[PDB]
Design a binder for this molecule. Structure first.
Ligand SMILES: CC[n+]1c(NS(=O)(=O)c2ccc(O)c(C(=O)N(CCO)C3CCNCC3)c2)sc2c(Cl)ccc(O)c21
Ligand SMILES: Nc1nc2c(ncn2[C@@H]2O[C@H](COP(=O)(O)OP(=O)(O)O)[C@@H](O)[C@H]2O)c(=O)[nH]1
Ligand SMILES: [Mg+2]
Length: 170
């Protein structure tokens, strides 16, 4: 009695993809994780009464032209699209990551959650209203997280599971 969910964490270099994934899985914060390390992590969790196996790919390179990225976008069931709230460029990059994923899926139905990470940093450059507007335009949830303090880390991943579970019934 278990359901599998293949999750992919994408976003510009330095936004906190690794720190979020490691906080979820290993309950610690990494200060300076090698940006080129790409790995998968598995863990069983209970969400809405369901024992869920999360299979999460923490992506490293974000290159347009990558056979491996095409493959993991085909395989991935949901996408955590992460920007940092103090990096406007990373928020602008989100549209490209969504376009790439939709292209690979040949679909509009793609489970995705917009994550504004580094919510513990005081010098915000991306207003929450703008990020909420973007998420509303895409029809996806928006969550601000801190991999440093663990704020909303489980919520971001579990919300993505909920999106996938729902899309399976449509
Ligand atoms: C690793 C298996 N895997 C995938 N396998 S895969 O497409 O062949 C793939 C994708 C990216 C990769 O970098 C790799 C890969 O070669 N690796 C990382 C994943 O284990 C190796 C791992 C050993 N060190 C170098 C990188 C494989 S896709 C995937 C998704 Cl979308 C979610 C969860 C997964 O576990 C997953
Ligand atoms: N203050 C703060 N720093 C973070 C947060 N998440 C990641 N970082 C830091 O930002 C840098 C990049 O994080 P990393 O996870 O390696 O980014 P990735 O390239 O997206 O995998 C590192 O120095 C992290 O310690 C966060 O929520 N808050
Ligand atoms: Mg990383």
């Amino acid at each position: 009695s278990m359901t599998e969910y293949k999750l992919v964490v994408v976003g510009a270099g330095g936004v906190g993809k690794s720190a979020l994934t490691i906080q979820l899985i290993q309950n610690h914060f990494v200060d300076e994780y090698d940006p080129t390390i790409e790995d998968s992590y598995r863990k069983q969790v209970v969400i809405d009464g369901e024992t869920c196996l999360l299979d999460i790919l923490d992506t490293a390179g974000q290159e347009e032209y990558s056979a491996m990225r095409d493959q993991y976008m085909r395989t991935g069931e949901g996408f955590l699209c992460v920007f940092a709230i103090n990096n406007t460029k990373s928020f602008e990059d989100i549209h490209h990551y969504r376009e790439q994923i939709k292209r690979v899926k040949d679909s509009e139905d793609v489970p995705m959650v917009l994550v504004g990470n580094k919510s513990d940093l005081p010098s915000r450059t991306v207003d929450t209203k703008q990020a909420q507007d973007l998420a509303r335009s895409y029809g996806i949830p928006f969550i601000e997280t801190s991999a440093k303090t663990r704020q909303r880390v489980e919520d971001a991943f579990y919300t993505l599971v909920r999106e996938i579970r729902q899309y399976r019934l449509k």
